[PDB]
Write a protein that binds this DNA or RNA. Structure first.
Lengths: 143, 177, 114, 79, 66
RNA sequence: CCAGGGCUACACACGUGCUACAAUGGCGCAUACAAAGAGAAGCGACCUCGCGAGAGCAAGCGGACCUCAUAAAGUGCGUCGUAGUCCGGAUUGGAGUCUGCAACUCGACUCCAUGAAGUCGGAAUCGCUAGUAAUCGUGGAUCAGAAUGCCACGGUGAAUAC
RNA sequence: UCCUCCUAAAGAGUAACGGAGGAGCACGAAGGUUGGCUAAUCCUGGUCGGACAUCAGGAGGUUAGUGCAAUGGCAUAAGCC
RNA sequence: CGCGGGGUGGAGCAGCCUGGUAGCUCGUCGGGCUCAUAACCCGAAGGUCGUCGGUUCAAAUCCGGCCCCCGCAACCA
């Protein structure tokens, strides 16, 4: 699967403060237990990890790429978000988790939805169909 | 009063070198040792507090000052005015004699001894510790305690910088891991 | 009637009296009295202090109480920190040696309560 | 409590270790010999060990010596 | 100080097994035979022995010899 | 076919057993009396080392002759004096042994230390009328090693049946 | 029925089925006097001890208290011993 | 709208009356009894006391507001 520098099969755990996908490649941190800690290549949190122990880290790629989180943002509400529901059906990958954050300090209408992807290409069209809706002032992979 | 005499000589002498004080009064000096003991179980059995009074009387060599609850608080379901913890403010000749009696014999008897925290300071250098088993004091017959009333001690100092405090305490040897 | 910073028993035949000390079983205890030359029968009360001190110097040879506790705390620590299987078991509050876990192992797992 | 005479380890593992060592750290090491104990020379090596389905990597350290590789490849995942 | 209320207080003759017999005031009873004078307590040596642990490698080599 | 893993997982439930909860008991010393077995790519004395398990050496025997292999309860003396107590022995750390390529998952045993629950068990429920029950110890198959299981042997030795 | 505030227009006083709340007791001491003392609350340190017991120090300043509602007043204390 | 009462384990009801710590029945869970279930027998768990705020050292309890539910009144017209 993941060709951790010239060898695959190696047990690893994906990081939960970032969402690596088959793109920039991934930095691999060796945790005490649970073997490898893939944290994607280049990331601030990843940065502190290197900061305390660079020696126990080597790169990894993708060998032969699923599950990711995205933060879409909408205008307040009064229903057009229901419009988003309608889109639920058009979205191919089954939504994994609803997470609206309308809180913050203002009338902001953000939603941290969790889903998946089969190929980076497909992802491209994902952002496309998110950008179309006017109420979707924002739509990007949350990290 | 031995180490008090010691103070008057080697202690001031000593510190004056490390602290180049303009004048002798500038050297810190232990002011008052305070044996606090908050049993807080008299609210259950008053005589138990009396036993605590026995212990402090057995250590200070003088009658303990029985503090009363300052505030009625449900967190302990105790109301203001109730005896809560006995104490002693021994100072002077007494405090020196006790002090010696402290570092020389009391402290060593402390099970699994491992120095003392250097971090125990109010910033004013007034050191504080807390023995867990009052029995380490010779006067206690050991067998005669029906409880293990640990207590705590506050070595109030005229020192301002807690570091000066460390130094002063250092003159009297002291642990300090 | 106090050695190793603790030991305050009596009436007991010295060896048992010493067994009271954390860090010493009967064997090591007997060994102590052996080198001390003290007869095991003697109740600690009968025991002369001029002998008790010899016993202190005697027990000094054998790691006890305080250091022992810290020491074991350190070995177990190493375990749980290193991530060795034993460590995992200790972190899980479970039998380490390899005992049945599907049924008994109440000691480690504590009461049947959960 | 496990062979008073000579700590045991697997030959191919040993050679794989030397090759790694004299060649300098290179890549985590695939290994199936959990029976193999530990060696100071191996310290630093990130040898990975089969857990019944996965060769999980482990950064050998000084405390980690008088132990066998198996003691770092739990097979039974639990909850 | 206030009379009577305080327990009797005199200079007892303390004595460690270590030989540092010392006379100091207190109440106690008569006096006491001790074991450790602060001077004869192992802090200045004790703590030292305390840390002594680490480096498996050497031990492993002891097992090595081959 | 292979290596490794797993059949040993662990909030829990049950069955069946071993060990205890003690003083007709434990501990130390001295000391008496078994039958039934098994054994060679085994049993392995004696002797030497080790606290020990064992290690080295090593006869005899494939056998009423050799070995496993001093049976233990019991008996005598002493001690502990009713305490969670010298009861109890789990758990764990450290240190070892042996088997076997190999003991991590996952072996048995030894030493040091540790020393938990438990102070005779709710409802309920089982076995047993004689050398039985109870209680103690021994052996074998299986087996490289690996039982409190099982099959087997002997010692001690009842109560009660209107 | 009585007590406190606002309404209430800076003396007093001033109505509504206007806005907000209390009293129908307590105490020989909580009274008298003499002397003495002064808070609340946070931070720091400290056996059990934790958000909160007691001790120590600091900051702090009456944000405390004043038998009971509110208002005014109180360190010369009327507050506390 | 007005007035009075109430809201407690999964369900029905105590305790709020006068502040400290919430009880019962059924039910729930585990075990037993039975060939099995039931009933029965033994054990055990189970309630932030409607909500918000205030009073108090302390609030299920005292006070006010709010929501919910029940009862009463809603008349001379």
């Amino acid at each position: 699967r993941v060709v951790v520098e010239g060898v695959g099969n190696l047990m690893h755990h994906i990081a939960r403060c970032c969402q690596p996908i088959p793109g920039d490649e991934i930095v691999g941190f060796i945790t005490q237990g649970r073997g490898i800690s893939v944290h994607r290549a280049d990331c601030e949190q990843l940065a502190e990890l290197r900061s305390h122990a660079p020696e126990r880290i080597v790169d990894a790629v993708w060998g032969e790429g699923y599950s990711l989180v995205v933060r879409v943002v909408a205008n307040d509400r009064s229903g057009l978000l229901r419009d988003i529901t309608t889109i639920l059906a058009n979205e191919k990958v089954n939504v994994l988790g609803v997470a609206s954050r309308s809180d913050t300090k203002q009338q902001l209408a953000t939603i941290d939805m969790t889903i998946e992807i089969y190929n980076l290409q497909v992802l491209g069209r994902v952002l496309g169909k998110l950008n179309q809706v006017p109420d979707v002032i924002d739509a990007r992979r949350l990290h | 009063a031995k180490l008090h005499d010691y103070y008057k000589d080697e202690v001031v002498k000593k510190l004056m070198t490390e602290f180049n004080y303009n004048s002798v009064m500038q050297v810190p000096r232990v002011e008052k040792i305070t044996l606090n003991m908050g049993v807080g179980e008299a609210i259950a059995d008053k005589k138990l507090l009396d036993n605590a009074a026995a212990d402090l009387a057995a250590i200070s060599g003088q009658k303990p000052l029985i503090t009363k609850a300052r505030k009625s608080v449900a967190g302990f379901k105790i109301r203001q005015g109730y005896p809560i913890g006995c104490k002693v403010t021994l100072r002077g000749e007494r405090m020196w004699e006790f002090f010696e009696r402290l570092i020389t014999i009391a402290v060593p008897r402390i099970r699994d001894f491992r120095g003392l925290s250097a971090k125990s300071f109010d910033g004013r250098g007034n050191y504080s510790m807390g023995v867990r088993e009052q029995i380490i004091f010779p006067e206690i017959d050991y067998d005669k305690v029906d409880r293990v009333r640990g207590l705590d001690i506050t070595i109030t100092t005229t020192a301002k910088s807690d570091e000066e405090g460390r130094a002063l305490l250092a003159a009297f040897d002291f642990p300090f891991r | 009637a106090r050695i190793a910073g603790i030991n305050i028993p009596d009436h007991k035949h010295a060896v048992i009296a010493l067994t009271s000390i954390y860090g010493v079983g009967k064997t090591r205890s007997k060994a102590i009295l052996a080198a001390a030359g003290i007869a095991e029968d003697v109740k600690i009360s009968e025991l002369s202090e001029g002998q008790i001190d010899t016993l202190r110097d005697e027990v000094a040879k054998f790691v006890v109480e305080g250091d022992l506790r810290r020491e074991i705390s350190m070995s177990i620590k190493r375990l749980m920190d290193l991530g060795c299987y034993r460590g995992l078991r200790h972190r899980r509050g479970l039998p380490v040696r390899g005992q049945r876990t599907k049924t008994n192992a109440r000691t480690r797992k504590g009461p049947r309560k959960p | 409590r496990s062979l008073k005479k000579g700590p045991f380890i697997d030959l191919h593992l040993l050679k794989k270790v030397e090759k790694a060592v004299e060649s300098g750290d290179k890549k985590p090491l695939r290994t199936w010999s959990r029976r193999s104990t530990i060696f100071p020379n191996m310290i630093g090596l990130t040898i990975a060990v089969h857990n019944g389905r996965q060769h999980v990597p482990v950064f050998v350290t000084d405390e980690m010596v008088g132990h066998k590789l198996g003691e770092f490849a739990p097979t039974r995942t639990y909850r | 100080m206030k009379k009577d209320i305080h327990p009797k207080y005199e200079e007892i003759t303390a004595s460690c097994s270590c030989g540092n017999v010392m006379k100091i005031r207190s109440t106690v009873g008569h006096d006491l035979n001790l074991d450790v004078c602060s001077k004869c307590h192992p802090f200045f040596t004790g703590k030292q022995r305390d840390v002594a642990t680490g480096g498996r490698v050497d031990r492993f080599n002891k097992r090595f010899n081959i």
